[PDB]
A paper describes a structure:
During activation of a pentameric [name] (pLGIC), the binding of agonists promotes the opening of a selective ion conduction pore at a distance of more than 50 Å away from the binding sites. Each subunit consists of a predominantly β-stranded extracellular domain and an α-helical transmembrane pore, which interact via an extended interface. Whereas ELIC forms a cation-selective channel with high conductance that is activated with high efficacy by the primary amines cysteamine, propylamine, and GABA, the cation-selective [name] is activated by protons and inhibited by bulky positively charged compounds that also act as open channel blockers of the nAChR. Our study has identified a cluster of interacting residues located at the β1-β2 turn, the β6-β7 loop and the pre-M1 region of the extracellular domain, and the M2-M3 loop of the pore that exert a strong influence on channel function.
At the tip of the [name] β1-β2 turn, immediately adjacent to Asp31, Lys32 interacts with a strictly conserved proline in the M2-M3 loop (Pro254 in ELIC and Pro246 in [name]). Mutations of the conserved proline in the M2-M3 loop to alanine ([name] in [name] and P254A in ELIC) resulted in channels that, apart from a small shift in the EC50 in the case of [name], show robust activation with similar properties as WT. Contrary to our previous expectation, conformational changes appear not to be predominantly transduced via an interaction of the tip of the β1-β2 turn to a conserved proline in the M2-M3 loop of the pore domain (Pro254 in ELIC and Pro246 in [name]), as mutations of this residue to alanine and glycine still permit channel activation. Critical interactions involve residues of the M2-M3 loop, the pre-M1 region and the β1-β2 turn that all contact the β6-β7 loop, whereas a direct interaction between the β1-β2 turn and the M2-M3 loop appears expendable.
Author numbering:
A (entry chain B), B (entry chain A), C (entry chain E), D (entry chain D), E (entry chain C): 7 to 316
The structure:
Amino acid sequence: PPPIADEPLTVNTGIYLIECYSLDDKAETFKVNAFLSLSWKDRRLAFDPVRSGVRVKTYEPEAIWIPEIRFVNVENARDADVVDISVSPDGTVQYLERFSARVLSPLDFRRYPFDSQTLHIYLIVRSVDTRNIVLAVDLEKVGKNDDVFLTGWDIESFTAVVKPANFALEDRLESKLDYQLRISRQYFSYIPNIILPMLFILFISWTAFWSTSYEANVTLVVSTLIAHIAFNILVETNLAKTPYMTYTGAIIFMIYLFYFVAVIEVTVQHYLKVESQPARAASITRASRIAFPVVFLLANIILAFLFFGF
Amino acid sequence: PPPIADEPLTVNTGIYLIECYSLDDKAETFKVNAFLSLSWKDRRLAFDPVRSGVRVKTYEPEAIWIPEIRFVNVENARDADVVDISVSPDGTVQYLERFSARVLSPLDFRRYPFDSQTLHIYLIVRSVDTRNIVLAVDLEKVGKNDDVFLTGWDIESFTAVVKPANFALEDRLESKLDYQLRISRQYFSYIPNIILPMLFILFISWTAFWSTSYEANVTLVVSTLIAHIAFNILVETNLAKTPYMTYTGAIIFMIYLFYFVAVIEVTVQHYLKVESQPARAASITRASRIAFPVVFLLANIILAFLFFGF
Amino acid sequence: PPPIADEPLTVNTGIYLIECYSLDDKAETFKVNAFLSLSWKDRRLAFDPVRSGVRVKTYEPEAIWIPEIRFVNVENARDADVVDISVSPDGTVQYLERFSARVLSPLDFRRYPFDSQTLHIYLIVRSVDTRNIVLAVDLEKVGKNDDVFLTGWDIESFTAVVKPANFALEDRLESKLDYQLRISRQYFSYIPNIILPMLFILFISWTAFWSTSYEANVTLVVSTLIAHIAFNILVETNLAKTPYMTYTGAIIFMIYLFYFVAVIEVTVQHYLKVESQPARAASITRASRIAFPVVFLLANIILAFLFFGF
Amino acid sequence: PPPIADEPLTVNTGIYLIECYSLDDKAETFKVNAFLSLSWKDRRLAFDPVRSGVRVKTYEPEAIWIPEIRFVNVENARDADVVDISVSPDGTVQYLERFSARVLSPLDFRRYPFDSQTLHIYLIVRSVDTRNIVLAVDLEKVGKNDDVFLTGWDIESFTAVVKPANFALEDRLESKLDYQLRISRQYFSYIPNIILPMLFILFISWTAFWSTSYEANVTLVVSTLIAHIAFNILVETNLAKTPYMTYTGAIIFMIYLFYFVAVIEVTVQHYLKVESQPARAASITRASRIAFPVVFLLANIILAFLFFGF
Amino acid sequence: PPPIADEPLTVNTGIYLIECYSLDDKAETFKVNAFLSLSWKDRRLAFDPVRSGVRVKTYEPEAIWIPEIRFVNVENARDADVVDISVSPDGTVQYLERFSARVLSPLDFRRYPFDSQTLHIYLIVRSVDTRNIVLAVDLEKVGKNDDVFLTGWDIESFTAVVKPANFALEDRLESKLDYQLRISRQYFSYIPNIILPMLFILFISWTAFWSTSYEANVTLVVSTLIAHIAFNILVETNLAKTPYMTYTGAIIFMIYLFYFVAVIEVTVQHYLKVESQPARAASITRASRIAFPVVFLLANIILAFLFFGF
């Protein structure tokens, strides 16, 4: 029994985030526990203030006609509990539920260690014999609480795109809204556990540029290559199979080349010295001591600029 | 109370994919959130346009007789919410739910890094005292949305096999349809994380073909063999126990042989040189420098052609 | 309201497997999605063909008395949806649900890489004031579909033990049936990923029988021992803590001994040669080159026969 | 509507284990699927055999007043299905459900490889205006079935503490029972996968007591230390963070010391021999060959006795 | 139908913890199973002791008006079962449910191995046409049981902040309470499995300060660096991505520097000795034997004080 009306019915939405948690980088999903605030005019049950009852009349969801508001980018059916329905004397309904769903929003990993994200929450409503249009009442839109806790993320701002996008879908039009949660990753943990350890073993790796023993250099450069494969796997594990190149995935692949040409050096250093050309051997080795660090710091500047500076 | 009819009743199906996600390569399952569109003629409740009501009459699932449409290759009971039922004046019912199930479709891993898949969604319906036949209404079949996001996969096309397959099952006939989602894997992530790293350590592995120290060569060839076992496990983990040979599983097993005959070489190089036959030692070693790379690039051409080119 | 009868009521069961999946070797459980077919005579609602209605009368589960059929070796309550109830004119009820439960069937890992299993599905029914006995109707027992897909397993045959086992349990008798799914493991994946890699590193391990350098031999035999611990863990992970000895668990423990006596050799080879007895040193070492491979191939024949040939 | 009585009402409990599974050592929880048998006298509905009906009258849970029996040490709400309610003519009710919950019982890991456990199942009932007391009817208490399968555990005995413990809790008294499942761990799997492999690498570790090469000894003692860290982690993973010392955790920490003083030896052996005191070097080394094995076998006897023998 | 009142209604809360478990350090969540005790005066149903019935009248949740008490920092909807409702003659309602939810409370990992935590449980209630205020009845607040078992944690005290915090939220005021569970981590497990093993491999690492062989020192210092990366990962795994520095994360990063300057030493020791300056070589090496242990024990005192002593 939809409210008889002369033109499209406006449903007034508003989300109040109470809890955020479990941002799954692999799955590209997060979990929200918030308030949903719906309000529409249904003159069909305007009541008479003085003639009976009180200021506002409370109802159960069964009596009133309620607009079916579905979340779009959500895995299962939104898990909600009705908190209060309050009809105003003019026939204005005040709906308020508390829902908990896990939302499916894509993430951009192009700068995975240092990146910002804009999570999306989408609300749609379908029509029957009257048209429905959703819109945000900003006073119920202040989704954030001063206690929102998203582990490993900094919460910038929860806002809503005021203008809905109205599709036509299966000989009926629907109205979609875009609630946007903007977050930036807390990169600090990565430095003392990934970045700095990865560099250290790379620096050790070419300590063999001040050595002449092949056995001790192959032990050196190779054992550090193993340690880098460990970090490479440790990072590739908590990250989805992106079709592009991540920032750490670039530098982690760059490092792979510095272990190859280092292995190439100590090998070339060896055949050369064993072939009675040590004048060339100790000449190459000495250059490496400058070339490898410089090209590295150079390529990183090239790489870093190619991602962040552009 | 099934609709009394003169011949088999046609139910007109149509799926509209809203979300795709969680393609589990190990489990061989994906998760879909879509629209189901059913439509059948039930003249038993044709209504009179002018005489009463309006153009279209809305019902609750309890009143009308609804065809029981079950998904075949699905784990648990399909999780659906009814969106709208709309009976046309001639007695045509327009059913529309929004379901979310996880579907069980086999995958072909013969070319695991670079492969295409055709996922299946099957709909069946059973008969009672009249026969039922399903068929697709292509206007409700445009399953795709311009936002379908399947991580690590490119979505080619969602179509439906228009001709149903009608089995006889337990003294009653059923009608089955085949909705087909065609996808191709986003292989790019595999190159800088598996393929290229795997090759590098293999090339380093036979840098010992330019060396004479057994100790430094056994350190070399063996330490790289360990690193390959790591990658071998890393790949065997995100992949089911296929009864055939995967493409990477072939090349990853081929690599295992190149580490064996390399270990064989440095060993043969050593007994030989220690046995006062260095004329043969440095002769073998020099050939290896050409044989191993050539046979590898050859075997890969042989292997690659044996999988993709045929 | 159980059907008044003169003697024990026979309920006629029948399972039709639609999907099989998720055989958890660690948990010793699998997941089935099948049809349950129950049929019993309840003369208490025999209806009159000509006098009224039609050939067969359809009911809702609430009206009719339905026998409570419970699955025995199942974790939670079987998750079923009723498909159709059809009472025959003589008072014969045709019940048909579609259930999905995860079943708990023990597995025998004595030949873990190459083994066959017989999964069990048990149905019980309890009595009230009349006795109930279950029995299989073979035309509804053809559980298999030509699409049953059990990853990493070959499905041999789904049959049912026709004779029920009738216990007495808590001053009431119950009737139990045994549906049996016979499967054999798809061993092919194990060879290029476990068996063959494990052997290779073992053969490399005693390439040190053609060498005299202690440093290069301890690097050899020990580094391969590490790689074997990796495979040992990799296999012990996807396998339950059986109280017996598995086939691979035997050969994987046998391999552990060949790494010990090899380490013993190179060590004995060394003290000996360092003690100015190289006549004995190079004598032992040369025998190893034959003893180790022969004893291995011998012990495997002994072991293999002890498991499969007996 | 509780049964009006003159004194505390006795509810007669009884559990019949049908399935046991999923004993999580990390979580300290197991999962049970059993029968619950309740029986109490409610004279308020004692009925007339001859005057009407039959021997026993069957009811639905809604009609009768049922005692609210809650499980104590259980995570979520016990998941039960009612099997039969049968009121005896005197007003004696025979209740029988089939439940499936996961129970939270602490475990004692003091002898983790070889240990016995007593799992607990607790039933409580709260009072209203009459007092309730639970008690076991041993004829319904034979919880075990000849098919109970607890992977990696031997089931000794399922019994019940007949005398309930009656607390006062929030101005109302409750009655608690103690059902006890006694189990002993199947230790066999641990020997060929943890214990024996751990010892082997320790014995190899001090094969360097028959060697003079520092490079080959540091390769020896250290590479085996790495393998022990692997086993140390492999065991610490499937085990909770106990506040006491486990048996394997003791011997695994003892082994850590034997790798330290071994590294200390080869180091002391070296400075000494390099310092032109080989008379002392080869004297220490020779003693190690006896000291380390003896102290080990001694400390193990000391340790083993300190845990099991006391 | 809220109770008509002259001023804000006081609801009297009280939590009785029955089970605590599953404190997820990664997720920063724990799981509680407790009693909720609500009590408010609803004179609108005061009954007449003498005139009818008995001392206390028992109701079903449907009849009475019940205050909607929601948990704040909880993932999904609190899972509760009503135990008893008992209205007093003056119109005082005694509500008691048993709930089980998983709570989301932030943890402070600044001293991760040795740390104390204060878990939070928050209760809110919203107003309608009368105001509601929650407050604790300490006789129902004794949340603890003498059986509360939180694995790997010591439970200090469960208390409640008696003064509620009353926000205004969306043109309606809410009343929030703070129940506080104070716990301290059981650090003992960490010493024999992380701390002591980590130190041992570090001490072994600079046993190369009593050695002159580069090959044996690079084997030494590097192989132990690998073992430390293992522990570093083993610890970083069971710990969230904090934006600050943990205590073990500091010392584990400090250790990384001691492996770098040690690798720097043996390298400098080598170029020097190879450059015919052994007078400086054996001079540096001898100082290291004192510098490294002292600076370590010093830096730890500095670090430890910087975290705990301040």
